[PDB]
Amino acid sequence: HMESADLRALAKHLYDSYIKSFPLTKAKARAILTGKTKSPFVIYDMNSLMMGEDKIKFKHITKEVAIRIFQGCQFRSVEAVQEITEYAKSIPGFVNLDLNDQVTLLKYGVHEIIYTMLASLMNKDGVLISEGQGFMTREFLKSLRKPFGDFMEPKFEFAVKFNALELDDSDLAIFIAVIILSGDRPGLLNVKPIEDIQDNLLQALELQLKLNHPESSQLFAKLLQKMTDLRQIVTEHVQLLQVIKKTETDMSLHPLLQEIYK
Amino acid sequence: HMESADLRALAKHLYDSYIKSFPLTKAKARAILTGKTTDKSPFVIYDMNSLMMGEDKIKQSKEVAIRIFQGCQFRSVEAVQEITEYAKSIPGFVNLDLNDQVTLLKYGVHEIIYTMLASLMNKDGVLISEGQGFMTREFLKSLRKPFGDFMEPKFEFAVKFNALELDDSDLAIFIAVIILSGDRPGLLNVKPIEDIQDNLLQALELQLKLNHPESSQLFAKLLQKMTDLRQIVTEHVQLLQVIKKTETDMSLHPLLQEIYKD
Ligand SMILES: O=C(O)c1ccc(-c2nn(C(=O)c3c(Cl)cccc3C(F)(F)F)c3cc(C(F)(F)F)ccc23)c(OCc2ccccc2)c1
Numbered sequence A: 001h002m003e004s005a006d007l008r009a010l011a012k013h014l015y016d017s018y019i020k021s022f023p024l025t026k027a028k029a030r031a032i033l034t035g036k037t038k039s040p041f042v043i044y045d046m047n048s049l050m051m052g053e054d055k056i057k058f059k060h061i062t063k064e065v066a067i068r069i070f071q072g073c074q075f076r077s078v079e080a081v082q083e084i085t086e087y088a089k090s091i092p093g094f095v096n097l098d099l100n101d102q103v104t105l106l107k108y109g110v111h112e113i114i115y116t117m118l119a120s121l122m123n124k125d126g127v128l129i130s131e132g133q134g135f136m137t138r139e140f141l142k143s144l145r146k147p148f149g150d151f152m153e154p155k156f157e158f159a160v161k162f163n164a165l166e167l168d169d170s171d172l173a174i175f176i177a178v179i180i181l182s183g184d185r186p187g188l189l190n191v192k193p194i195e196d197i198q199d200n201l202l203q204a205l206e207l208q209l210k211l212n213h214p215e216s217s218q219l220f221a222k223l224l225q226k227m228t229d230l231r232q233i234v235t236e237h238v239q240l241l242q243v244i245k246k247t248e249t250d251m252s253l254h255p256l257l258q259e260i261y262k
Numbered sequence B: 001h002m003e004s005a006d007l008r009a010l011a012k013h014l015y016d017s018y019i020k021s022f023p024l025t026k027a028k029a030r031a032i033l034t035g036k037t038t039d040k041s042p043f044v045i046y047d048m049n050s051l052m053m054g055e056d057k058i059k060q061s062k063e064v065a066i067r068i069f070q071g072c073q074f075r076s077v078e079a080v081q082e083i084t085e086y087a088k089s090i091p092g093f094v095n096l097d098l099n100d101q102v103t104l105l106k107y108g109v110h111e112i113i114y115t116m117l118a119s120l121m122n123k124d125g126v127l128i129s130e131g132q133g134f135m136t137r138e139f140l141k142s143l144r145k146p147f148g149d150f151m152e153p154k155f156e157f158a159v160k161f162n163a164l165e166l167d168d169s170d171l172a173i174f175i176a177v178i179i180l181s182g183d184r185p186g187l188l189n190v191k192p193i194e195d196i197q198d199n200l201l202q203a204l205e206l207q208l209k210l211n212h213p214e215s216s217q218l219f220a221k222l223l224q225k226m227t228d229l230r231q232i233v234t235e236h237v238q239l240l241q242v243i244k245k246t247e248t249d250m251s252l253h254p255l256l257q258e259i260y261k262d
Helices: A004-021 A026-034 A046-055 A065-090 A099-120 A138-142 A146-163 A169-180 A191-212 A219-245 A255-260 B004-021 B026-034 B048-057 B064-089 B098-119 B137-141 B152-162 B168-179 B190-211 B218-244 B254-260
Strands: A041-043 A126-129 A134-137 B043-045 B125-128 B133-136
Touching: A004 A065, A004 A169, A004 A191, A026 A099, A026 A126, A026 A169, A041 A046, A046 A065, A065 A099, A065 A146, A065 A169, A099 A146, A099 A169, A099 A219, A126 A138, A134 A138, A138 A146, A146 A219, A169 A191, A169 A219, A191 A219, A219 B218, B004 B064, B004 B168, B004 B190, B026 B098, B026 B125, B026 B168, B043 B048, B048 B064, B064 B098, B064 B168, B064 B254, B098 B152, B098 B168, B098 B218, B098 B254, B125 B137, B133 B137, B137 B152, B152 B218, B168 B190, B168 B218, B190 B218
Parallel strands: A041 A134, B043 B133
Antiparallel strands: A126 A134, B125 B133
8 A cells, every 4th residue: 555654754744734733732731731841820710710811811711600611612622623624734635635525524523633632731630721821620620510510521531541542742643634534424525535545544643653652552453442432522512512502591692703603 | 462373363263252152144144145045045024014924934912113123122132142152252351350241241232233233234124033034124214103213323334334344253353352342431450351452453453454455454444433333322222211211012121121221
C-alpha cells in the first residue's frame, strides 16, 4: 500500500500542521498542569470566578453562574471548530474531496475531536482554560446546580481514561486525522476516496505508535477502541443538551448570538 | 508480547472451540443462503399464511408479532448459553475473579449475538430455526406497534459487517476480544482482563493478515465495528423498556432479565 518512509513523511506533515493550527499543545498543557513552569489563575469557587473575569477578563465568561460557565464552554467549542477546520485542510487529499463531503465530515467529526483534544487540557483535578492562563477545578465544575453539575463530570471521567494511554502531540495529530476521515458519516456522496485516505492515515498511525511507544503492546488497537468511548459520550452529550434546552428558560442570548452558536 | 507460533496456536484453539460451541456456523449459513443445494433449502416466511405453513414444516393462542418476538427471546437465551460455553474455553477467562466473569458476560453477550446474527443475514432476511426457515426483512418491518422496528437496525449493521467478508476462524477471535473487554462498568481487576485481551488482539491481528493479506487495514476496520455494536445494544435496551411498559402478555426469561438489569 505505502512505503515506510512515506508514512513518516505523512506523520511529520501532520505534526507540523497540528502545531500551527492549535495554540495550546498537549506538551505545553502538561507543563502547566504538572507544575513544571507563570502559575495559572485558579477558579475553584464563586469568588475566585469573579476575580478571574475581572483580572484576566476571560472572553468566554465575560445571568446565573452555572449558565455563564456552560455558555462559556459553548463559546470555546465554536472557536475550536474553526481550528479543526483549518487543520483538516492540511490533511493530504481532504480538499480534493467533494465539497459537500468535506462539510459532512467536519459536521459529524468535530464533537469527537473536541472531546479528544479537551483531554489534553485536563487531569483528574481540573481543566485549563484561555490558552492555559486559567484553571477550573473539577470540584467547582461538578458542584454546579441542577443539570449543569452532571453535564461536566463525564468529560473528566473520559479524559482520565484517555490520558492513561500517554499519547503525545505527534500521536494525536494522526489520530485526529483518522477521526475526520470517517467513511461512515451519514449522507456521504463518495465514500471511497475518504476510506482510501483513512487507510493511509491508519498505516501512518500504526507505525508512529510502534516507533514512539515500542514497549506499549497493542496501543494501536487500544486507541481505536477509544473511538467507542468518544462516539458514546458524544451521543450522551446530545441528550444532555436537549434536556437543558427543554427546561432552562434563563438561557436566551441575543438572537444573533443564538445563531452563531447553532 | 507473544511469539508468532504461539499466536497461531491460540487462533487454532479458539476456532476449534467455536466450532464445538456454536452449531450453526457462518460457513453453514452461507451454504444455505447461497443455494445451489437441494438438501439445505429453507422454507421462506414472508407473510401471515406462509408463517402459518412454517409451523407445520419447520418447528400458539397469541398474536403474530408477539409470537415472533417471543421466538427471538427463546433463541436469545439459547445463544447466551452457547456464548457462555465458548467464553470458558478462552485461556484465562475461568481463572478471573468470579464477579468479573459475570460482568464480562453481562455486557458482552449482546454485542456477540448481534455479531453472530449477521452471519445468518443478508439484505433480504435472516435464517431461523437452525437454518430450516428464512424470515424476510420486509415481513419483519411490517409488524405492528414497536415490533416492526425491532430487527431493522440489526439488518443495517449486518449488511455493513458482512461486507468485511469474515469467516468463522476470524470471528472466533473477534468474539473472544469482545468478551475480554477491560472497560466494562464495575470490573474489579481490570489488569488481568487487559492482559488476556492484549494476547487476543495480537492473535486477531496476525490472523487477519494471513487470512486476508490483500484486505488492507482490516484489523483496524473490524475494531471500528465495535462502535456499531455498542450503539445497536443501546437502542435495543430502550426498545425493550418501551415494550415492558406496554406489553404484559410478555414475560422475559430470567436469564435475559438479569443481563438487562443496569
Ligand atoms: O481549548 C479547547 O480546545 C477546548 C475545547 C473544548 C472545551 C469544552 N467543551 N466542552 C463541552 O461541553 C463540549 C464538548 Cl466536550 C464537545 C462538544 C461541544 C461542547 C459544548 F457543549 F461545550 F459545546 C467542555 C466541557 C467542560 C466540562 F465539562 F468539563 F466542564 C470543559 C471544557 C469543555 C474547552 O473548554 C474551555 C472552557 C471551559 C470552561 C469555561 C470556559 C472555557 C476548551
